[PDB]
């Protein structure tokens, strides 16, 4: 039932998922001047050398690239995290136009899109158990601006024609997510939630300061995806972002001065 439209979008989600009005909801506006530099924060450890991508899927809300998370092959550690988080999938949020699409904002600035690399804490054994824990998930968030192409994204863009509508999936092996990362791992971090139903308050957010640049042609291909299933009225998969939620009693910490 839930989606991003007038009648089922973010302003409606609290009816099925009352935690939507909870104390640690995501995304948020990152007020860069209010974020506290924390010299105690460790550099983020991103270990993706042995990542095994499996499939690419249109779930009717985004598309995701799924990984083998049955072993510690692609893990996030350090930064604000205690222990080891396995990469499950990455997906994106994007806009109908370049001036919107990101879920996090930076001083109220919206980017064209936001990449989420979703990881779960191995101490909880499976992602279903991890989403029931306040430190279950770590999501690495990367902003996309429009300019030069990101060569590492092109393999993703080129298969989207094969998963146009909700339910479609394809083999997507040997995709290296290191090709999606910016130079700097400087980050902001805060305790938050999933940004779609069920909006579980299980996420340590790690949002990189440095955006990646993608081309207009790359993001145009995201906008050709469909929310609808094949044979239903065509509704472009655009504006699949939740707006910024109240920060309430939280502190955003910066890894950098
Ligand atoms: C209730 C469940 O079975 C959980 C276990 C794993 C969860 C998924 C983990 C991956 C995240 C990514 C994502 O969240 S985000 N934007 O905060 O990274 C959309 C929700 C979704 C699909 C989650 C939906 C709820 C799932 C399926
Ligand atoms: Zn997301």
1-257: CATH topology is Carbonic Anhydrase II (3.10.200)
DSSP strand pairing (29-30 vs 105-106): parallel
Q: Report the atom number in ligand 1 closest to the C-alpha of 120.
A: 9
SS3 assignment, position 6: coil
Ligand 1 atom 3: residue of nearest CA: 128
> What are the structure tokens assigned to 65, written together?
């690239």
Which residues are annotated as catalytic?
Answer: 61
Experimental approach was: X-ray
Biggest alpha carbon–alpha carbon distance for the chain: 54
From the CB of residue 167, how many other CB atoms can be counted at a distance below 10 Å?
11
Beta strands (DSSP E) in 79-224 are 85-94, 105-106, 113-121, 137-146, 169-171, 187-192, 203-208, 212-214
93 is in an annotated binding site: yes
Ligand 1 binding pocket (C-beta < 6 A) is 116, 118, 127-128, 131, 139, 194-196, 198
Ligand 1: residue of 131, 143, 190, 199 to mutate (most ligand atoms within 8 A of CB) is 131
Q: Report the atom number in ligand 1 closest to the C-alpha of 195.
A: 17
Considering every ligand atom, which ligand is closest to the CA of 91? 2
Query: Are 85 and 119 spatial neighbours (Cβ–Cβ below 8 Å)?
Result: yes
Helix (H) or strand (E) holding 219: helix 216-222
> What are the structure tokens assigned to 194, written together?
């999933």
Ligand 1: residue of 196, 207, 244 to mutate (most ligand atoms within 8 A of CB) is 196
How far, in Å, are 61, 77, 234 from residue 65 at the CA level?
13, 21, 23
Distance CA 50, CA 75 (A): 9
Distance CA 132, CA 247 (A): 21
12 is in an annotated binding site: no
Considering every ligand atom, which ligand is closest to the CA of 136? 1
Q: Report the atom number in ligand 1 closest to the C-alpha of 93.
A: 16
Residues 6+ apart with CB under 8 A from 227: 3, 4, 60, 61, 166, 235, 236, 237, 240
Resolution, Å (one decimal): 1.4
- Domain limits of the chain? 1-257
């Amino acid at each position: 039932h839930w989606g991003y439209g007038k009648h089922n979008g973010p302003e409606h989600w609290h009816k099925d998922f009352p935690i939507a009005k909870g104390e640690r909801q995501s995304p948020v506006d990152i007020d860069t001047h209010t974020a506290k530099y924390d010299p105690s924060l460790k550099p983020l450890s991103v270990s993706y050398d042995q990542a095994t991508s499996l499939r690419i899927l249109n779930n009717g809300h985004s598309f995701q690239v799924t990984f083998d998370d049955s072993q510690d092959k692609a893990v996030l550690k350090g930064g604000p995290l205690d222990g080891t988080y396995r990469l499950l999938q990455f997906h994106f949020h994007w806009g109908s136009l370049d001036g919107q699409g990101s879920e996090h904002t930076v001083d109220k600035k919206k980017y064209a899109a936001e990449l989420h690399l979703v990881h779960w804490n191995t101490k909880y054994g499976d992602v279903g158990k991890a989403v029931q824990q306040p430190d279950g998930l770590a999501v690495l968030g990367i902003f996309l601006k429009v300019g030069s192409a990101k060569p590492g994204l092109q393999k993703v863009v080129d298969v989207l024609d094969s998963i146009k509508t909700e339910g479609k999936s394809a083999d997507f092996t040997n995709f290296d997510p290191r090709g999606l990362l910016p130079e700097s791992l400087d980050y902001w971090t805060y305790p938050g939630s999933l940004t779609t139903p069920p909006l579980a308050e299980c996420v340590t957010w790690i949002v990189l300061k440095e955006p990646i640049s993608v081309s207009s042609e790359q993001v145009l291909k995201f906008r050709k995806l469909n929310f609808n299933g094949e044979g239903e009225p065509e509704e472009l998969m655009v504006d699949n972002w939740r707006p910024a939620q109240p920060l309430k009693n939280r502190q955003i910490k910066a890894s950098f001065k």
